[PDB]
Amino acid sequence: IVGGQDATRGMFPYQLSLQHMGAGWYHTCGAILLAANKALTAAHCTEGREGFRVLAGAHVLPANDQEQESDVASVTEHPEFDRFGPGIPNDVATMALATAINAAGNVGYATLAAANAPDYAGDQARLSGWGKLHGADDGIADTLQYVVTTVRSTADCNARMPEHIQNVMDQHICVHSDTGTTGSCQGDSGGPMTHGASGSGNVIGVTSWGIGNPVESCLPDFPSVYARVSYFRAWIDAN
């Protein structure tokens, strides 16, 4: 997260760290805890890869402070996920957890936007995750970050985009500050967009993509694009 701050423990009880197996674990994406054995993330976090675990109730990743964790038994990416198509369509995926994650301590299940939800244009919302704090940074954040921002309409999103990347769709939900100082970054993908500025809010988006340049992989000067949960609610529940 760019332009944000440390979260407080238990602020986002459904926030997961999705970790991929290489030379040791490494945080590759955020995820969203939906139930005891079910999680939600971005499809581009899992397509073509295997060997995952999720950390629940974590705060400082280097501290190994997760309250619970589970191996990922299987992943179901959206059948129409097009990783390299304009706008990265249908960038959602569910995950079956080998170990049950209980609603206890700083861990809880997200409430998702309903299928008939409004577009939330102009509403406040929060982005969370362990993504990089700046586009030029080498590594991700150690402590869970969050930032308050503003949901924008489809046309507003594309107007704020580079003229050659006006690929925001109604199946997306984007956020952007008029100061151009806040947004998501690599490592935040797959995490939740939480409705509202404070307190409990529905998860209304899944971190998908953003804009970079030759020196910064993420830029708050342009919107951060999420997969709209209300658009994918029926599919997520069914898969």
Numbering used by the authors: 1 to 239
Reported in the publication:
Compared to traditional thrombolytic agents, snFPITE does not require plasminogen for thrombolysis, although its presence enhances lytic activity. Mechanistically, snFPITE activates plasminogen and degrades fibrin(ogen) in a multisite cleavage manner. snFPITE is inhibited by plasminogen activator inhibitor 1 and α2-antiplasmin via a competitive inhibition.
Prior to crystallization, the protein samples were treated with the serine protease inhibitor phenylmethylsulphonylfluoride (PMSF). This treatment facilitated the clear observation of electron densities corresponding to the PMSF molecule covalently bonded to Ser189 of snFPITE-n1, snFPITE-n2-A, and snFPITE-n2-B within the PMSF-snFPITE-n1/n2 cocrystal structures. Based on protein sequence alignment, the closest homolog of snFPITE-n1 was found to be the fibrinolytic enzyme from Enchytraeus japonensis (44% identity). High-resolution crystal structures of both snFPITE-n1 and snFPITE-n2 reconfirmed that their catalytic triads consisted of His44, Asp91, and Ser189, and the weak substrate specificity might be caused by Gly183 and Ile88 residues in the binding pockets S1 and S2, or the four additional residues (Cys, Leu, Pro, and Asp) inserted into the S1 pocket of snFPITEs. Notably, both Asp91 and Ser189 established hydrogen bonds with His44, a feature that is essential for facilitating the catalytic interaction. This peptide was bound to snFPITE-n1 with the Arg580 residue inserted into the negatively charged pocket, as in tPA. Meanwhile, six snFPITE-n1 models with six 7-mer peptide substrates from α, β, and γ chains of fibrinogen revealed the absence of steric clash between snFPITE-n1 and these peptide substrates, suggesting that snFPITE-n1 could accommodate substrates from the fibrinogen chains. In all these models, the Lys or Arg residue was buried in the negatively charged pocket.
